[PDB]
């Protein structure tokens, strides 16, 4: 048994992924930068025993492929699992596709050839992804010709999926029908890739709906069509591959290996017009998915900040002996560390030295009542500006407003009941204009999480 904090130190928060938060860490001797996924044992349950998890981790470390994330180390303590691996800076595949001006079948074929090359390799080693989606397709670096890296391969076998809607955004579109009923094998990853290929060439999911349960209903039935006008500009071989990848019965569905030898992958990687209607639809889709996620994370961060404000105020009130409302530096460190000992250690706060630094950063700006307000506003600082940034990206015409039809789509992806947000809208919008600005939209989210 080795300790994580003795080998690695936290540098900055990279983001939130499946089963936990991702941190940019650095080796205290060699100085090698690494991405670390911190899985909380309280929030995430184990689907397998300790000996099964250690055997797969050991295998996953020895595996190597240019389109699969490299895992380096694994650590464990009383309340956490630390998966240490290679860090990628190119960002998510779909976030890059919306920034580029043109996109065609040659670009889509080059993307899916890499995804299949990685999936084929991991299938030969008896490892299944299960939760493959665009969010799990990161680009290795900030370049035009950057390789794709599939992340979280094999973690679904050992960790239970979250039931919280903030952790289930954009999952129902790509999940295979057999995974919903229980009997599934490695062919579920081909379906998930088939769905991604369908969106790359049209910009609309094949199985869609006004809410999570409606999307799963269409997926379970397994029916889709190429009746949208944008499919006329796409080739017949691209559609044939999608037909074979989105076959309902997994035994009849094409394998990852045979999908590489398909005429479409062989012809478009070894005329081709730009798919302009597809890029505009991927841009709208990505913006809608990111605003829905930012809304749920904003509502979540606000709720945790209220709980932590009252808990941190109760800790400092007990420590205040004379009752003057003031405390020393060393006292404030003991109280802030006590919050992590009671309400679970923070992802950014890797050790006691990280807490001492965070307390000093609050004291530079900032009376313990004033210290709580600043310390807790810095926790939400990322989620508040991410919501505003996501609202500005969603509002592509820069009108400053979001229509009622757009709210229904946003709240639909966030799985907020139709009658609940329409009732909350009436509490702020009393003139019924059928549209809201950012402040009004933020006020709706605050009312939805008890404010
Ligand atoms: C985009 C996001 C912040 C979510 N992210 N996700 C990953 S997944 C990962 C990161 C660390 C450990 C394991 Cl098991 C998987 C990851 C990584 N490698 N490098 C940079 N960022 C990463």
UniProtKB/TrEMBL annotation:
EF-hand domain boundaries: 307-342, 354-381, 382-411, 416-451
Sequence positions that bind ATP: 37
Coiled-coil parts of chain: none
Enzyme class, UniProt record, top EC level: transferase
Keyword Nucleotide-binding in record: yes
Amino-acid positions noted as binding Ca(2+) 1 in the UniProt annotation, renumbered to this chain: 320, 322, 324, 326, 331
GO molecular function, one term: ATP binding
Signal peptide range: none
Disulphide bond pairs: 204-449
SMART domains assigned: EFh, S_TKc
Domain of life from the UniProt record: Eukaryota
Needed cofactors: Mg(2+)
Keywords from the UniProt entry: ATP-binding, Calcium, Kinase, Metal-binding, Nucleotide-binding, Repeat, Serine/threonine-protein kinase, Transferase
Binding site for Ca(2+) 2: 367, 370
UniProt-listed CDD domains: EFh, STKc_CAMK
Binding site for Ca(2+) 3: 395, 397, 399, 401, 406
Known EC number: 2.7.11.1
Catalytic activity: L-threonyl-[protein] + ATP = O-phospho-L-threonyl-[protein] + ADP + H(+); L-seryl-[protein] + ATP = O-phospho-L-seryl-[protein] + ADP + H(+)
Protein name: non-specific serine/threonine protein kinase
Source organism of this protein record: Toxoplasma gondii
């Amino acid at each position: 048994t080795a300790i994580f904090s003795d080998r690695y130190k936290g540098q900055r928060v990279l983001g939130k992924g499946s089963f936990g938060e991702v941190i940019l860490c650095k080796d205290k001797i060699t100085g090698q930068e690494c991405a670390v996924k911190v899985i909380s044992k309280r929030q995430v349950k184990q689907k397998t025993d300790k000996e099964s998890l250690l055997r797969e981790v050991q295998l996953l470390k020895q595996l190597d492929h240019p389109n699969i994330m490299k895992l380096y180390e694994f650590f464990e303590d009383k309340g956490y699992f630390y998966l240490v691996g290679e860090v990628y800076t190119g960002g998510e595949l779909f976030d890059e596709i919306i920034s580029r001006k043109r996109f065609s079948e040659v670009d889509a074929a080059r993307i899916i050839r890499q995804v299949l090359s990685g999936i084929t390799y991991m299938h030969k080693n008896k490892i299944v992804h299960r939760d493959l989606k665009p969010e799990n397709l990161l680009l290795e670096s900030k370049s035009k010709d950057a390789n794709i890296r599939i992340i979280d391969f094999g973690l679904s076998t050992h960790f239970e999926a979250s039931k919280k809607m903030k952790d289930k955004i954009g999952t129902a579109y790509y999940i295979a029908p057999e995974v919903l009923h229980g009997t599934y094998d490695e062919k579920c990853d081909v379906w998930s890739t088939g769905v991604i290929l369908y969106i790359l060439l049209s910009g609309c999911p094949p199985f869609n709906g006004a809410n999570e349960y409606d999307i799963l209903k269409k997926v379970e039935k397994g029916k889709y069509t190429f009746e949208l006008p944008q499919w006329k500009k796409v080739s017949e071989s691209a559609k044939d591959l999608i037909r074979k990848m989105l076959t309902y019965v997994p035994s009849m569905r094409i394998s990852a290996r045979d999908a590489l030898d398909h005429e479409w992958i062989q012809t478009y990687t070894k005329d081709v017009p730009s798919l302009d209607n597809a890029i505009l639809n991927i841009r709208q889709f990505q913006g809608t998915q990111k605003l829905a996620q930012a809304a749920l994370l904003y509502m979540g961060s606000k709720l945790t900040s209220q709980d932590e404000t009252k808990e941190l105020t109760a800790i400092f009130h007990k420590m205040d002996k004379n009752g003057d409302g003031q405390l020393d530096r060393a006292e404030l460190i003991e109280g802030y560390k006590e919050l992590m000992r009671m309400k679970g250690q923070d992802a950014s706060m890797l050790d006691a030295s990280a807490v001492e630094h965070e307390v000093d950063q609050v004291l530079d700006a900032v009376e313990y009542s004033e210290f709580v307000t600043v310390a807790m506003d810095r926790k939400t600082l990322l989620s508040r500006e991410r919501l505003e940034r996501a609202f500005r990206m969603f509002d592509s015409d820069n009108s400053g407003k979001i229509s009622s039809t757009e709210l229904a789509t946003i709240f639909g992806v966030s799985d907020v009941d139709s009658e609940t947000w329409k009732s909350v809208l009436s509490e702020v919008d009393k003139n019924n204009d059928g549209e809201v600005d950012f402040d009004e939209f933020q006020q709706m989210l605050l009312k939805l999480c008890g404010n």
